[PDB]
């Protein structure tokens, strides 16, 4: 019984995902987030383990839901006449990385190192669970401000991870690789690495490097803010024009700029607690 179990709260957002409301699970007064997805608007569908058909978004969330805190977790879900409703964790207090970056501008490297590190573990998690996010960016990342933990959200453009070429893509253009732009083809891992690179530039310069199609393909990176040489290196590396030339996840995490990561809590005390 959907509307017995939860107590609708304020619309928290509307965008390329749909309509998200704050909610309380009356059953234990747990802070949750209720999201509505219209059937008419879902272009990608998938089969539950049971195999019955849901929106891919749900398939992907089930697959990563256990047991990490790196990724937002799907509690439950329901079907309606024209919509599916998803019940997902709600951290509080929370802010998303974009809003965070807009308020506080470009970030200290020690902080960007922490976040960026945590994003890496959350993308590894998804890859490990057989899931490709396809829309990694500041908007799709929440900062739990007390714990200093980051959570990856919004699997609405995602896909089951595979080793072959993808030829569809409905994520955020500006974070998409040159080879998508030029050839409508890409591979999951390599494209994720690219997006991970735009994100890093974003963290450390307070804004994305490439705005237009031509600059993405040109692939040449200008820094508008004092950035460490080691960090500029990992960035230019992540954004190698040729996919095979890009760093794997291991290599990013074994990079000299990635060393000495703060722990999440530590990061909150040092940077998030005012």
Residue numbers in the entry: 33 to 306
Manuscript text:
We determined two crystal structures in this study: those of inhibitor-free Pim1 and inhibitor (SKI-O-068)-bound Pim1. It included 274 amino acid residues in one monomer and 68 water molecules in the asymmetric unit. Eleven residues (Lys29–Glu32 and Leu307–Lys313) and twelve residues from the C-terminal fusion tag are disordered in both structures. The structural conformation and hydrogen bond networks among Lys67, Glu89, and Asp186 are well conserved in our inhibitor-bound and inhibitor-free structures.
Human Pim1 kinase is a serine/threonine protein kinase that belongs to the calcium/calmodulin-regulated kinases (CAMK) group. In contrast to other protein kinases, Pim1 kinase is constitutively active, and its activity is primarily regulated through protein expression and stability rather than posttranslational modification, although regulation by phosphorylation has been reported. Pim1 has a typical serine/threonine kinase fold comprising two domains [N-terminal domain (NTD), residues 33–120; C-terminal domain (CTD), residues 129–305], which are linked by a hinge region with a unique LERPXPX motif and the gatekeeper residue (Leu120).
